Ligand binder design. Sequence first.
Ligand SMILES: [Ca+2]
Ligand SMILES: [Ca+2]
Ligand SMILES: [Ca+2]
Ligand SMILES: [Ca+2]
Ligand SMILES: [Ca+2]
Ligand SMILES: [Ca+2]
Lengths: 194, 197
Amino acid sequence: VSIPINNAGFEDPFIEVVDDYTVDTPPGWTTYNPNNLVPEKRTTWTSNNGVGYVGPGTQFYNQLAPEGRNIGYIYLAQKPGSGVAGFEQILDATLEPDTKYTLKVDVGNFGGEISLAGFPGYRVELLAGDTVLAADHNNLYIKDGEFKTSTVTFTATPDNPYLDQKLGIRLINLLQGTFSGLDFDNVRLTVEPA
Amino acid sequence: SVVSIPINNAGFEDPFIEVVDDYTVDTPPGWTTYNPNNLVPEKRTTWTSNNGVGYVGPGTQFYNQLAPEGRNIGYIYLAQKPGSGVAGFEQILDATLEPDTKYTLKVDVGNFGGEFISLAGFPGYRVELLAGDTVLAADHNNLYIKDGEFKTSTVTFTATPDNPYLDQKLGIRLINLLQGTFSGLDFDNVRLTVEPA
Ligand SMILES: [Ca+2]
Ligand SMILES: [Ca+2]
Ligand SMILES: [Ca+2]
Ligand SMILES: [Ca+2]
Ligand SMILES: [Ca+2]
Ligand SMILES: [Ca+2]
């Protein structure tokens, strides 16, 4: 009923200090970088992704991390309109027919003070091979300091072109606004019979 | 104070079609053909890629209900293999993106069934709410629609005063994704409303 995802809640690496965070791609995820917005050689000033600690006393959120200690974030330095980037993970599971997939991700708009107000917008995708089967493109209004849960669902029929191809997830910073950073957490993919 | 945004031929009711299950193969009034991948030729002949309007009236073979609104639906068919690109309808609206406003776009998306060369199967759809060239929010094939049925796609978007695209023209796209066969789908009942956030 549940499909396994590595580091699904970005709990690895463990981070001790409040509001600390990494600037390396979270383990178990690759950087989705179709427009080359995330450079090969990262700096703390460049487009970046990583993991962050949302602990008691966080200046980023009114709540704690939706799950565990940690969230995964994407930050883009380029100006709005330059493209997208984010997290991708291809799974060791395949598109199977008469099956309904439910992808749930929590999407965070962190606030605080540089000022962190505003949002670049998000997209969450369910892949089979290279094909986006279903995606939530920025449908939820998320206020600074809050998380909302994005849901993407998909049902494959026996006649689907992409059966037995590898399932995948993308979590995308759209860069359609500033402050152009956002957080994700608690990735969940469950199957049930159609 | 919820108010709607004018859309031309929002229901594809223009033009009138008298005979049930008959259809035009030309771009519907008030809409342009979204063809970013040139999939739909300028002159259409029935078994080529085309789009148009179609009458869903009593006795239709194509659906387990009549049209969601009025007599007519808007359809898009693509003859290429699943994977070759996307095409559908676009209409740029008169209104412009406004701050502190929640937008609600609702569209009925249809998966016709039957035979004609077997119509079972579906290409995938995407509904987009636009400002300028920017897709603010979109429903990329999020609803499972059985052959013979319609489902209501909903796209919402709240504009903040810091939004980079204020005062750009609003737009709507209804897209055949070409990720399956039979590679035709219908649309109907396009509505866009605004209300304060
Ligand atoms: Ca977590
Ligand atoms: Ca650090
Ligand atoms: Ca923010
Ligand atoms: Ca109609
Ligand atoms: Ca069909
Ligand atoms: Ca229905």
